[PDB]
Design a protein around this ligand. Structure first.
Ligand code: EYO
Ligand code: BR
Ligand code: BR
Ligand code: BR
Ligand code: BR
Ligand code: NA
Lengths: 453, 453
């Protein structure tokens, strides 16, 4: 019999691409994979499918749902979490995605697949799959570490037993001592309690225990203690099947070919954040002052006066799309500046590149602790304020940036970080090849889905 | 009017407490329906009509056909008490699992606000969910047992021993509690049988998958395990017991002639299966001990000759029904010999009578640890072998029994056990009266069921 798994990601680029990669890993084991998307997001999937769909390359099916943008008052064409800018739109966007339930229940009634893999943001997907005795898996797109850290913070609230914004508290139970401050947690949890965000997080975490289990885009060997903590202490059924990006395995490259090994800083934040002019200026002055050679990807009043001229040949600025994977895997790259989103952290680990960690929002401050204090392949830029809005007060200055750029390239422990990063790269590829922890966990998941009655 | 359906397994120890819970719901103006089978209906009918006429609200019964023939049981075998021997218990569980069709049909028809389903129906969660009905789990046991089973299942302390009698501590517990493999069921520790191990797995997983757990305990009795169950093991729970207390001749006249705390009550229940060689050893122990006793035996090769004559002053035997509650509450009773089933333990705590603990099966060896090592209101008879079958080889001898009867009446700690038992009695009645922990928790549960959306 052929097994059928439906994939239901939230319309955000950082959930969608890893969800596609999971679909491909299932397809490559002779499982029918269907992804549910919306019409204004379909182009993203259909590009990657035709790109990936060469010789071999088993078939990935698409099902399109109508997103009720107008029904909840979203400006028409807002079908993506990236377009929900401001306090106002994010709350309408979630009421938006919650009204996809009717369509999901209809599609599952009709197709009766063997399993639903639904985004963390659809906690109600468990109840929906259950109506047809279909097992539902949760996919978050983050580290075991973050999944554990959020859950012990939610349950033990260690931040209610401090008095000031900067007072450090330990994460309880953890097999490593991890200190955070309130500034690093979202302002709803600690300052002015908003029921909406707090309920939303409650139902997401409760869904990890309510559902059949969790798919995790990590490998056992990367964070063995949190892969265990998540399953034992916090009692989740889980599989680690990542890094899922390794499934299907330029002008700046020619530039890089001319340079010494481990000599270039790559800076790329992604389309996650909006980079404001004053922040870009301070980054520009830091790069010049540091002396380090650099490739800087930006998504002209914000460049210092002589900048383009004075860095000609020690520095490259790219506007828009860079071939990120190829640039990170190049021998010339010695470091990677990032916001510590899990997709970006994984591409650093996989390329074996140490990281300057610039956490902004979501789970990024926990990812920064994994990278800097446990894996020890990174250096903090000094950003410590959780925020989905970008205020002038939170702009990180030249001196802080410059200190991190120097430390990640020519600091005492720079070479050590580089070696630790090279080990994790070798472990990552080994996990996903036959006999690997992540290959095996995927085999065990599929077997268990076959046997489910 | 709010409507709650109660779906207990056909075992006298689940059924009676389930009726008492239904009465507590009725007394707060909730429509209570209990699902039973036709050969079990008489048990509920008796307790209803005896308790009713007193004006107390009506409890409805719904009968399901038990598929005895479909799974190869006798047509007369509608009760876990008739499934005697290795073979029949397995058919009995296949039996009760085929009640799903009828439960789904009845819930579709009647649309109640909540399903309270026995621990043994883990599938009842998905069945209730099909009609967006919350499902509560009811076990009939202590917080201690619920915690102990779950810590033993997850942290497997028994893999690290080498012999059947080697003591291991229960992990994470705030008490040091030492058990041996002999005290655990033979499937979990010796020859791993998928059936009993899968069944236990799905029961424990249902505590987290369902809306929450009703617990027939009071907070004050085991405050540490009431907390551990909710926090460490992350269950939503209400403690509403002892549910026994909601409601509230020849042997009494006999007892009136005796000293305070001078009589041992022995009653295993009419549940219990006592073989003749076991009863003989109990008889010789009672004589040799010199202690006064009332001994209730289930409805004569097992009595020594002239037994009834030689004990005419000191000792009374009752065949069949005894007014158990009235006998245990009488001033003359100084001890209670019982099997450490939670219903029995609760009638000891509630009468304020210390116990000789005779664990046989289910959760009883964990209950025995609570009573002897944490509440310290009991003395073990020295049964340490978990078994659903009663073999002549495992019979507990006169010498062991006689030692426990002496120990519970005139041993070192006898008076202290008596005092500790009297404190727990006072706390038990306080818990279920208005303002009590158990009255409150029931009010909060009902409120939360009203507000369910
Ligand atoms: C099962 C799952 O319980 C989830 C809550 O966990 C909160 C803290 O863990 C403490 C360790 O308990 C062990 C088993 O845990
Ligand atoms: Br680790
Ligand atoms: Br850090
Ligand atoms: Br306790
Ligand atoms: Br004991
Ligand atoms: Na736990």
């Amino acid at each position: 019999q052929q097994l059928h798994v439906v994939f239901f990601p939230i319309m955000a680029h950082g959930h969608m691409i890893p969800t596609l990669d999971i679909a491909r890993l299932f397809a490559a084991r002779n499982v029918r994979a269907t992804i549910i998307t919306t019409p204004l997001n379909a182009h993203t999937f259909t590009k990657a499918i035709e790109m990936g769909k060469k010789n071999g390359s088993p078939t990935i099916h698409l099902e399109l749902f109508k997103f009720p943008a107008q029904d909840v008052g979203l400006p028409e064409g807002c079908e993506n979490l990236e377009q929900a800018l401001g306090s106002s739109l994010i709350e309408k966007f979630f009421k938006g995605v919650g009204l996809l339930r009717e369509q999901l229940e209809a599609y599952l009634e009709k197709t009766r697949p063997n399993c639903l893999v639904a985004d963390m943001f659809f906690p109600w997907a468990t109840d929906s799959a259950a109506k047809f005795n279909i097992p539902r898996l949760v996919f978050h797109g983050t580290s075991f570490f973050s999944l554990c850290a959020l859950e012990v913070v939610r349950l033990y609230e260690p931040h209610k037993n401090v008095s000031s914004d900067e007072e450090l508290f330990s994460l309880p139970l953890f097999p490593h001592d991890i200190k955070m401050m309130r500034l690093q947690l979202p302002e709803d949890v600690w300052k002015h309690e908003k029921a909406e965000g707090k309920t939303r997080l409650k139902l997401i975490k409760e869904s990890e225990l309510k559902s059949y289990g969790v798919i995790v885009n990590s490998f056992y060997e990367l964070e063995p203690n949190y892969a265990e903590f998540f399953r034992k202490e916090l009692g989740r059924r889980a599989w680690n099947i990542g890094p899922v990006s390794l499934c299907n395995r330029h002008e700046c490259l020619k530039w890089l070919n001319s340079k010494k090994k481990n000599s270039v800083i790559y800076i790329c934040f992604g389309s996650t954040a909006h980079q404001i002019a004053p922040q870009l200026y301070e980054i520009a002055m830091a790069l010049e002052a540091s002396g380090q050679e650099f490739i800087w990807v930006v998504r002209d009043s914000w460049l210092p006066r002589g900048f383009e001229q004075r860095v000609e040949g020690k520095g490259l600025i790219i506007r828009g799309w860079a071939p990120q994977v190829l640039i990170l895997e190049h021998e010339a790259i010695g470091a990677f500046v990032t916001h510590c989103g899990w997709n970006s952290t994984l591409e650093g680990i996989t390329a074996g590149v140490p990281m300057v960690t610039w956490p902004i929002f979501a789970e990024q401050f926990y990812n920064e602790k994994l990278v800097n204090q446990i894996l020890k392949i990174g250096v903090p830029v000094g950003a410590n304020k959780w925020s989905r809005e970008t205020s002038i007060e939170d702009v990180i200055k030249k001196d802080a940036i410059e200190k991190a750029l120097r430390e990640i390239m020519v600091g005492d422990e720079a070479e050590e970080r580089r070696s630790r990063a090279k080990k994790l790269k070798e472990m990552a590829w080994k996990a996903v090849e036959e006999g690997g922890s992540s290959y095996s966990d995927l085999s065990a998941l599929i077997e268990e889905l076959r046997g489910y009655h």
